[PDB]
Amino acid sequence: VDVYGNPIRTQQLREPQTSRLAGLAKEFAQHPAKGLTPAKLARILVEAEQGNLQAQAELFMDMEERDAHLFAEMSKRKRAILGLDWAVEPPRNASAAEKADADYLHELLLDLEGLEDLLLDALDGIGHGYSCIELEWALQGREWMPLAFHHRPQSWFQLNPEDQNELRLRDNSPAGEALQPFGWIIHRPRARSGYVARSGLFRVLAW
Amino acid sequence: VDVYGNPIRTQQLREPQTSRLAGLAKEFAQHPAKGLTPAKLARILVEAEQGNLQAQAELFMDMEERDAHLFAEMSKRKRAILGLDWAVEPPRNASAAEKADA
Amino acid sequence: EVEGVFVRATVERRCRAGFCFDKEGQGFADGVLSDEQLEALESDPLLKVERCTFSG
Amino acid sequence: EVEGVFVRATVERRCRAGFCFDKEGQGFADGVLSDEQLEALESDPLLKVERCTFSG
Amino acid sequence: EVEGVFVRATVERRCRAGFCFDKEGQGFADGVLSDEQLEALESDPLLKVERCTFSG
Amino acid sequence: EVEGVFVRATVERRCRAGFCFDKEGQGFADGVLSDEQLEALESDPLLKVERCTFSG
Amino acid sequence: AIITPALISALKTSFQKHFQDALATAPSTYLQVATVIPSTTASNTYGWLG
Amino acid sequence: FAPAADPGAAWYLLDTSRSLKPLIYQERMKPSFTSMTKEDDEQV
Amino acid sequence: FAPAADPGAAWYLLDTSRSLKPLIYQERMKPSFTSMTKEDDEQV
Secondary structure (H helix, E strand, O other): OOOOOOOOOHHHHHOOHHHHOOOHHHOOOOOOOOOOOHHHHHHHHHHHHOOOHHHHHHHHHHHHHHOHHHHHHHHHHHHHHHOOOOOOOOOOOOOHHHHHHHHHHHHHHHOOOOHHHHHHHHHOHHHHOOEEEEEEEEEOOOOEEEEEEEEEOHHHEEEEOOEEEEEEEOOOOOOOEEOOOOOEEEEOOOOOOOOOHHHOHHHHHOO | OOOOOOOOOHHHHHOOHHHHOOOHHHOOOOOOOOOOOHHHHHHHHHHHHOOOHHHHHHHHHHHHHHOHHHHHHHHHHHHHHHOOOOOOOOOOOOOHHHHHHO | OOOOOOOOOOOOOEEEOOEEEOOOOOOOOOOOOOHHHHHHHOOOOOOOOOOOOOOO | OOOOOOOOOOOOOEEEOOEEEOOOOOOOOOOOOOHHHHHHHOOOOOOOOOOOOOOO | OOOOOOOOOOOOOEEEOOEEEOOOOOOOOOOOOOHHHHHHHOOOOOOOOOOOOOOO | OOOOOOOOOOOOEEEOOOOEEEOOOOOOOOOOOOHHHHHHHOOOOOOOOOOOOOOO | OOOOOOHHHOOOOOOOOOOOOOOOOOOOOOOOOOOEOOOOOOOOOOOOOO | OOOOOOOOOOOOOOOOEOOOOOOOOOOOOOOOOHHHOOOOOOOO | OOOOOOOOOOOOOOOOOOOOOOOOOOOOOOOOOOHHHHOOOOOO
């Protein structure tokens, strides 16, 4: 199972969750930054608080693109992380089997292509408040492998009507769709204490 | 029991206290910072003094979100703590059992 | 309905004219009326009792 | 007595002759009689209420 | 002018003939006369208060 | 249906001849005619205002 | 027995809450045959170019 | 009686709803309204 | 003169009091209410 205890079924790992949602891949950003007034920005933020993250995500993307100073600051901050050396360590006073497991995981991460891109995509959650990266699982015989990492736009998700801290896919239904276990790497950095909608830094930087 | 001496019953630990208050989880912040005047702020503070903390809490959240300088200062102050190494130490001249517990 | 008559030809107290004889089977057990007087009426059975509801 | 009239400045639901108008200030709050119909009578205190006992 | 009437179609306490009632909306706020009796007449707006100066 | 009514004996500025005095006229929140005159006539209330469903 | 069985009636009674909210609303259904499109004003002028 | 045939897999869902605002809770507790000081001890 | 000789020694005392609610203070000092709307800033 996963860390959260949810049951894990290897049948669903053969295909991405969003494969059966071909409608999402054909969408285009609406560019809500053009012709933006303080009233429009306030409405966008308030609506995002209520579970309409599409407009907020598109506005954040436009804000990132259209401001050179903000873009330079964010790029510098992320490149600071991207340049750090990393290692995998075994748990406290680990045993020989645990040390072997940690060593094998370290070797696997070293030889896993696209790690830097994964880190860059995950770091987008700093400004957007949450970043979702879809996993491609493949079997090279008896051992599962992450084939590739796909970053999905924040505009593809929403909030659960019954839970303001749980994200869901946009599948044309009011309640969306729950995220598949082991199918995503969700990064949600916490600069301020609150719900996921209010947790982005771009919310502070908008005004 | 707890430090304050109140009796402790392990039966109530199976479920969160707020689980039976499903109404709370469905609420949305009222954003009292928009259209805020000095009179409104004074009324909010005075009402909070009397036990109405909802408006004060929402106003504080809006204040944190809408001010970049204040947010940066608070974030820096908190990150100062978040980066400190910590340890658990046994009481004064503790015994072997106390050391094991620690 | 009278769920208990408590009569069984028992000697129920009937304080009338300054003397408490037993005239008839005045046994009753209900909260309809005259509970305070029911105290005097159903104080001393003095004889064996058996309730047979009259379904009144 | 009438603990509360529930009348001043408020108008309640009054279903009569198949049409439920709102007037006459028939508000009340007690367990005396017609308790079931009390819901229908107090089904629309649309306007602000201001109680005042009649000491009935 | 009149400082205030506080009528709302309700007086505070208009007590006459040994009985205190509530009607006629005789609420005033001024020290022109009968302030001692104005304390008794006023000082009891049981219902809402609406102030509409008559500019008298 | 028309939404907009004032039935609390409330005061509104209605101008008869050279002056504007308390009176209740149109008292609606919707307008299709006499807008320029309604503005003077439909000055929001001075006192408590409550709305109903005339459905006229 | 009790010479005032009416007064003791409240003494000998008991209250148990089993009918309280012993019901539920019908399961949510608009999700299947409707989609939420939240807005931020008192209107929605939809527009498309056929 | 009351039928309807609809698609579900289309990019649009028939009879679309509009959750414009959440199920905000409105309350009348104590020294927040006049219903409780210059009135009976009423709460809505 | 309405005196009351009392033993006050049995399990109960005469004219026993019943404290239901304490003296919670009720205040009306904010524009929130219609007292300040309908009147000249009357707090209660």
